[PDB]
Amino acid sequence: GPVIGIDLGTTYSCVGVFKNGRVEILNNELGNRITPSYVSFVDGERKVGEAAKLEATLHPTQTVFDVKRLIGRKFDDQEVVKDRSLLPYEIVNNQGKPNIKVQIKDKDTTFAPEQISAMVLEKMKEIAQSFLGKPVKNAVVTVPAYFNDAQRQATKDAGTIAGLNIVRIINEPTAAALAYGLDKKEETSILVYDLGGGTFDVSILVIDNGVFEVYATAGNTHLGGEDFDQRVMDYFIKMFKKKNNIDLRTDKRAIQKLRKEVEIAKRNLSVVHSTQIEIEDIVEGHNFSETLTRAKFEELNDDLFRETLEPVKKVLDDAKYEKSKIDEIVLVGGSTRIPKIQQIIKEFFNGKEPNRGINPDEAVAYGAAIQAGIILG
Template sequence: MSVVGIDLGTLNTVIAVARNRGVDVITNEVSNRATPSLVGFGPKSRYLGEPAKTQEISNLKNTVSSLKRLVGRSLKDPDVQVEQQYVSAALVDVNGQVGAEVSYLGEKRQFTATELTAMYLSKIKQTAANELRLPVQDMVLSVPAWFTDIQRRALIDAAEIAGLRTLRLINDTTAAALGYGITKLDLPGPEEKPRRVCFIDIGHSNYTASIVEFKKGELAVKATACDRHFGGRDFNLALVNHFHKEFKGKYKIDITTNPKAMVRVDAAAEKLKKILSANQQAPMNIESLMNDIDVTAMITRQEFEALVEPVLNKATAPIEKALAEAKLTKDDIDFIELVGGSTRVPALKERIQAFFGKTLSFTLNQDEAIARGCAFSCAILSPVFKVRDFAVQDICSYPIEFSWEKDADIPDEDTSLTVFNKGNVLPSTKILTFYRKQAFDLEARYAKPEELPGKVPAFIGRFSVKGVKADPKTEFMICKLKARVNIHGVLNVESGYYVEDQEVEEEVKDEAKEGDDAMDTDDKKDDKPKTRKVKKQVRKGDLPIVAGTTSLDEPAKNAATEKESAMVMEDKLVADTEEKKNELETYIYDMRNKLDDQLADFASEEEKDKLRSKLTDSEDWLYEDGEDATKAIYIAKMDEIRAMAGPITQRYFEKVEAERAAVQAKLDAEAAAKRAEAESKKAAEEQAKKEEPAKDEVMTDAQPETEEAKE
């Protein structure tokens, strides 16, 4: 079983896996460590990840981006309206959810954001499986801290449709904090002052600041603040607007009238921004931008910073808000850790450093820290890996309240209660008590709708409590409901039960006096223990709960899963068909070359003419009628050529085999001769050794006589 962490980004997605006693970031099919978060549609198949990026400019209307920012939203949401300027496909309403209308397999199709995200996650799943050579099922997925219940449920649904089980949805900065803390061996002990770190994550579209306290073996998030509309794309947009004006005056072209030109300028602005992070000036050159006009421009870092000044002015707002919510000052922070690609912008780093008045820290990989943290979290939750214990305590981003209908028998009863406050520890469980005579409903919603992103509905879920019957003695039933915000940040009423007040005997313990001796103690053993009657609530049975939440119901989820599986099979068939087509094309050219080269001496002129004719006919068919043939037809065409070329290639291989056998026989003969020579030499040496001892013996006996003669 694999342990996978996924940092699902607006622009790119990073996959990390726990293995080899550590965490590795894995590469995709083109060896990139980040995969574009794009889904595209074509006349034959879908394009997911890298293939979607490759065909994006030529297929803009059928390519969908910003998947993470669309999931769980409605078309009327103002945030979605903002997103339309970054998404080239047409956004539409699909049964109350935002979706995209695209041309797929030659017809207009509509897909919800949840389905589109599921398509992309199935690609990520396959990328991980190809690298690991293992099936991938479990994963931990990162989400922005500002995601609401409906958005989190939509992501979990998307993962399930893709065949993935979400072990945890973890907030971006919390994942980075886990990756930071789990590798530190110098964290303070339980009794010491905690280490306070401010994690600042600025990605392509989102800015999050989190204040986290670390102690040995644990982290606790104290506060998190976000700006949903602050990121790298805002810097890109400032550059695009600048060049739009410049090209309009200099070249008399308006790039806003040409979507492809806009995408190309945006891509150039992204590169230019990165160059300016390390250089004082950078050029922009785009060939045939529109109307066959080549454009060139130059911009300095100073000019760029002036363009993005309105964005930079908001650079410290989330930090100030997070500090205020944590009831801390900037002097209380020990380290400031920056992650996210946009934190490389020098002007942004300067603003943050000036705010804190201390050096910033970049000990984590800015692009991969969140994915690594997700993989660590997955390893902790998975039974496959043994990981150092590290507790993660996150917090609720928004207050949650429950409301219910007033009971006629309790006229002064409150009908709503804020159960989970903002900043409440997560995961968290609360027990709610109700006195009821009959079945009743509860509704969970966010207590402060104005704090939610865009126009996300405040509604979370409706929970119907069944099986309620009045107790004849008390005329009501005491109902207990277990409400829980789970590890994903999702709310559920997990269970219900009813209790009865009963009088039970409880032993009263006597406090023995210090002066009592052994005899007194023995006497006391014979006394009956003192008891008293106390009222206690005793659990009597369970109450069924019917939940109505924003998650997909089972039939809809199963239908979406089947639909996704069918599209995966279609994509595989198209890929296999394309592979067979390429094999046929390669075989035609290869056979034609071999016929004039290595097979030339093994075929008669008649055979050559027939085979050449067959190759030409197959080639003509391939580029005309065979452009859109099936996999089976390509295989059949290949078999026809192979059958005709078979006798020729057989003769060639027979000759090659004969030559190989002759060479092998020669080598065997040489080896046998060498062995015989070696054996003969060895026999001679052994014979010589047998004769040597006799000579030594004679010399040894003669030696003393010679010496005496000399004396």
Template sequence: MAAIGIHLGSTCACAAVYKDGRADVVANDAGDRVTPAVVAFSENEEVVGLAAKQNRVRNISNTVVKVKQLLGRSCGDPQAEKYIADSKCSIVEKTGKLSYEIDGKLVSPEDVAKLIFSKMKETAQSALGSDVNDTVITVPFDFDENQKNALGEAAIAAGLNVLRLIHEPSAALLAYGIGQDSPSGKSNLLVYKLGGTSLSITVMEVNSGLYRVVSTNTDDSIGGTCFTEALAQHLASEFQRLYKYDVRENPRAMMKLMNSAEVAKHSLSTLGSANCFVDSLYDGLDFDCNVSRARFELICSALFNKCIEAIRKVLQQAGLTADNINKVVLCGGSARMPKLQQMMKELFPLVELLNSIPPDEVIPIGAAMEAGILLGKENVFLDDEMLSVECSAKDILVKAVNESGDDTFMVLFPLGTPLPARRQHTLQAPGSNSSVCLELYESLAKSLVKEDDKFAQIVLQDLDVKEDGPHDILTVLTMKRDGSLHVTCTDQDTGRCEAITVEVAS
């Protein structure tokens, strides 16, 4: 019995195979265990992986990168608009769908993803020596139904039999056997994924072998590419210092520096220094520069701090501290960086940091293990429930007022939160008020919250006026699998309580 686990990231893809009770990542035809998620088109062929990435300097307008960011999105989506603005490959809208325009032909994002999945399938089958197609595919928590469907359809078009779509943090826990080997007892785990284009942090509760999401957040403003860009800018400054030429406005030269910076960044995860050499960078001039790990960490110090600060925000959102976390699981290629791991150990001094599996291999290994578990069950293909996970379809937010008197919104249930789920929130209101109103809003992730997005409110009246501080209103929100939301508000001083149930919150 054999099966495949595939993780398609924004910048890289990775496949693992499950056989004889264990899961292992397999190397591609170039000998690499991770394949760049890059597809280059020419008149006669499509090239996937490292060759496409290396040739991008010469074929930039016909090379597709980061296709995962466009899958399942439509024109008008803020993330899609950002992707289109940054893309060097022309993207057009036709009959309501976005497609790449390559040499006069339209290529859909699903077709690009299909080529990457085909490459992963070939890699896995070559390692297994047989035509195994049973596969589990990983998806981020913040993927909506359209994105999940697009990803699944691309995998099916590549000839894969998709057993299940599994969330990336759950796959990470499976890779380490968390909740499987010793299912009794309750613990909190933090899954930290720093990929090429985003940072995703998820706090999960494991109880009797079941996973529950406590809090999750994805930041698209930081990823491994940001570290590469920072190093590339440093190299451009060094070139200007040596040769008095500024290459920052030269796209071709900067892409060469980005390629060199990326190789150096990877080397600095294991070595104390790395050499950056670029042949004919500008006006026939070669560039050679040595960068130490200490220099790289100094250049990227603000980025490292941002990566750690994001953890504190998620813990605060979950109502937890670092001491409440039992284990931390590292995922994503950029989580290999020694400085980041050192800072995480300082934040969690008493917590086990799980990084024995290479971070960029954790998620596909977990997916392969899930595939093995599913194949071990009878009638797996007849159980439609196994192909989907009930999740909140929108962000559920609570409205508050900050010290300046401005409205602020806190996300309580992020889009994609598996259901059922429960959250606790303490709302503070001026002690001079005799009533407090809690307002709940729903919104698509990353979009601005408008007054029209309000779907429920609950009012606590006849409160005792206080002069020595604010009212503390404990709010407990429980969202069931059917999307209904039960809200209870309790005044901490008097015990006065109000409750409502919204039939379909999201």
């Protein structure tokens, strides 16, 4: 049968197929190549993807996301304790393991993380089946390089629940190296800088005669694009209060509409220098109309951009590497399109240029698809 490739990300998932000697990254039913990793349990309906994400605003306790943060971990791990305090849906202690609790038709229902991740995998599988017009039973699925045996096994178990045999788990850095087609011959040391919507990961990947090994990993589990948007929102919430004596945080619907326009404005400022953020009647009788420059966008976030170099220093130190030992810097995740990010990395690497695909959110799924093709021969 076919083997598909899935990037099971913290904030999103992406599915690729390898067919007629090319990788195709598939669109979801709404025409996007990225599906938000969200599942909602409201009014006796289950939704998966953007339709679930949209329920988060009015149904924050029934809308599950960021499950990758919980999968294969223990309820008392410091990281899960921190996540229970950040996440608005109920996380309960099932015999030492975090489980998700929600209501379906008012009934208390508990899920393992791998059961919610299975629902994201199910949807990616259905996109692949309808595209290939065949059943799909096998997949390459990616995980972070720092995932331990229980986190990898819990991801495999997610596959099994979704009716997917996970024939191979590969780390996200390896998947990126496969996508960018880094020469497998002789020896290459690669810094993989992966700045996503929710998380930052950096790995030293060494490629030696077609053998891939991650020598060191570090990161910041709570640093990504969504933080850069929150810094902009904070700024404009302050200004709108100053100007109109309206605190937009008093209206959940206003904050949702602002967040959407702020995300687009940030994307615009990776290409242009100045952009308009506009919402008619952000509340009744009050338009939101503001300009954001690249310079102000950077000023609002410069300490977070700069923070990304602390994990870079840690992996160089952990692997007893000097900046020079790094042969190529590869960038993954849409957040790496921010010019200032590219600039800061370059100057850290004493002038060296980094490589950024042009679909950096799809590189990991692309690599997983390539791995599927490699396995099929």
